[PDB]
Structure formats: structure tokens, C-alpha cells
A and B are shown apart, each in its own frame.
Chain A
Amino acid sequence: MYKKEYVIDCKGHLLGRLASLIAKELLNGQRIVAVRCEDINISGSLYRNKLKYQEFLRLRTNTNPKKGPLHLREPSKILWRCVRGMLPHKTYKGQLALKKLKVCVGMPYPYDKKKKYVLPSALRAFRLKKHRRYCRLGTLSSRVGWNYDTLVKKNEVLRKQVSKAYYKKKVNNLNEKKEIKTEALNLINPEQRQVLENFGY
């Protein structure tokens, strides 16, 4: 957490754990961009999750619902809320930490060209037994009225093509570099070359 800004790819993660991971980092002093928040997984069965959400929604302020619990139903929003929950947001430091976090659905403008990081101690594949029921967050959101899910998916798909295109180019570049290295290893100095070989490069 000594980087300028960590971009976290939220696909295949387990919600609460991910949030927890984020929160500590934020507290420490790290700018976090939680990206691709539609594919965050919850450890409960989908129906159960939905029920829970419904229950949460039901707890509103009786006198004037303009105040009280704002039931933000965007997956990113939900994630943000979760993060906040795990923070001392009522102080100043906590507030600052919260501010530092930025959440995104899918991938927007700058966070497509930035390196996407994964939290391995929070992954669904590493935290759930494969005979247990899990729930995609996007789906849950859709169920409790988010609407912009299909659109998001489409956008993601579109982005994927672009990424693939870029990836091909990158691969080509890498290959070229390798070739160059191969060529030039004979053009250096013997002892130096040997040394290089010894140290892996």
C-alpha cells in the first residue's frame, strides 16, 4: 500500500472480505479505485442475499425517509457503503479515508489503461468451497432494481475486444524484444554475458 493509486479489479472477489481489505489500506493512506464492481460475489445463496437486501430496504426512517438509511442499489454504491461500514467515518481521518476510495461499475476512462490488481485473500475461488451457493452482486442489484446491468455488460464486452486488440500488440512487442535480446546477447562482452546468464536475465 505504498503505491500512488491502487486500482482493484473487483471480479471474482468475495464482497465483505474485499471491503475489509480495502478499508485497512484506506486507513493507512492509500488511494483505492474499486473497478468492475458488477462481478463482486457474495457468499450467501442469491435468494438469501436478495431477502437480506429487502430487509435492509425495509428499515427506513419512520418520520421522514428523505433522511435515514439511503438504500443505494448500484453494486459499486453497495460496495462503497460496505467499505464505509468498516470505517470510523464519523471522525475526520475516517472521512478522509472514505473520500480516498473511489468505486466504479465496469471500467471507465483512466482505469482501463492502469494495471488492475487482485486481492488473493479475498477471492471467491480461494474462500468458498465449490459446493456452496454464491451470488453475483450485479444480478442482486438488478433484482432489487438497478436496470443498467445489461448496458454495463455490453460495455464490458466492448472493452474486452479493445483489450484483446491491445494485448495482441503487446505480445508482438514482447516477442520483438525477446528477439532483439537473443540477437544482442552475442554482441556484448563474454564475461558480462556469462554473468547475465548466471543471474537469470
Chain B
Amino acid sequence: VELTEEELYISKKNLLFKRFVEPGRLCLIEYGPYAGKLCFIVDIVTITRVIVDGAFITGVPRMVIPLKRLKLLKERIKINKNCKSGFLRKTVNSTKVLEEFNNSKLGKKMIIKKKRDEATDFERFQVYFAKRELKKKMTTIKNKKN
């Protein structure tokens, strides 16, 4: 039996708790040897511990972690509970979830940060120069407006 127009309501009904820890949630590891790394929730051990797996695209092996060490992302991909690592890899690649994540604000900012970190002095200088140029132009525009 269908909903007809209740579907819309369901879609747009504010839920206080988005991002549930559950199989196939994206997840940014915050604390430990692995941090800033992405990793998917495979199974769940207890109310406090979960098994994560960073699909061989990511560097992080299947392992148990405290949920406290994870920050849930808006991303999810439907997966069978008992899904092995290979299967996970297959699915995520297919769905292009990583790309989506990157596109998203947080992912973008992370990537920017990474770029900043990895930059050469010259590159930094180039950026500075660009900024200066923009400021000049911006200043001119402001003057014109005035």
C-alpha cells in the first residue's frame, strides 16, 4: 500500500538525529594512529565499540574501535551486515561515495588543508601573490563603488 503524498512529508520531516552509526556509514577517524582517515562501519561490537574498515582505497585495516574515536559523516552506502572487505571496496567504488564526500563542504575543506600542508614555499608565495592581486582588484572595485 502506497503513501501518495505522505512520502513527501516523510522526506521533509526534521529529524534531530541524522547520521546513525550503522553498517555502511562513512566515518572520519579522529583519534589514534589513524586520524583524518575515512573508514566504514562494518559490524558493531557493543554500545561503545564498533568494527570499522577503511576500504583498501584508504590506509586503515579492519579493526575494532571505540565509537568515541569516530565522527559520523553524512554519507552512507547500503551493505549486507556480514560484508567482507573486498565486497565493501567493490560497493563503495561503484557508488562513488568518496567522490561525493570530497564534493561535500567538509571533505573539500579537508582537501584544502592537505594541500596547504603539502605546499612548497614557492607555491605559498604564488598563493600570496594571487591574494595580493585580488586585494588590489578588490580595492579598486570598492573605490569605484564608493
Contact = CB atoms under 8 A, between A and B. Distances in A.
| Chains A and B share a contact (CB less than 8 Å) | yes
Interface of A: 177, 180-181, 183-185, 187-189, 192-193, 195-196, 198-201
Contact of A192 (B116, B119, B133, B138): B133
B137 A184 contact: yes
Interface string B112-146: 10011001000100110111011001100110000
B127 A196 contact: yes
B131 to A, nearest CB: 7
B138 A184 contact: yes
B131 A196 contact: yes
Interface of B: 109, 112, 115-116, 119, 123, 126-127, 129-131, 133-134, 137-138, 141-142
Contacts, number: 46
Contacts of A192: 126, 129-130, 133
Contacts of B116: 199-200
A201 B142 CA distance: 19
A196 B130 contact: yes
Given A192-B126, A192-B130, A200-B112, 5 more contacts: A180-B142, A192-B129, A195-B130, A199-B115, A201-B134
B72 to A, nearest CB: 18
A184 B119 CA distance: 25
23 contacts: A180-B141, A180-B142, A181-B138, A184-B137, A184-B138, A185-B134, A187-B137, A188-B133, A188-B134, A188-B137, A192-B126, A192-B130, A192-B133, A195-B126, A195-B127, A195-B130, A196-B131, A199-B119, A199-B123, A200-B115, A201-B127, A201-B130, A201-B134
A201 B141 CA distance: 18
Contacts of B131: 196, 201
A184 B126 contact: no
A180 B138 contact: yes
Nearest to A200: B112
A167 B142 CA distance: 21
Contacts of B119: 199
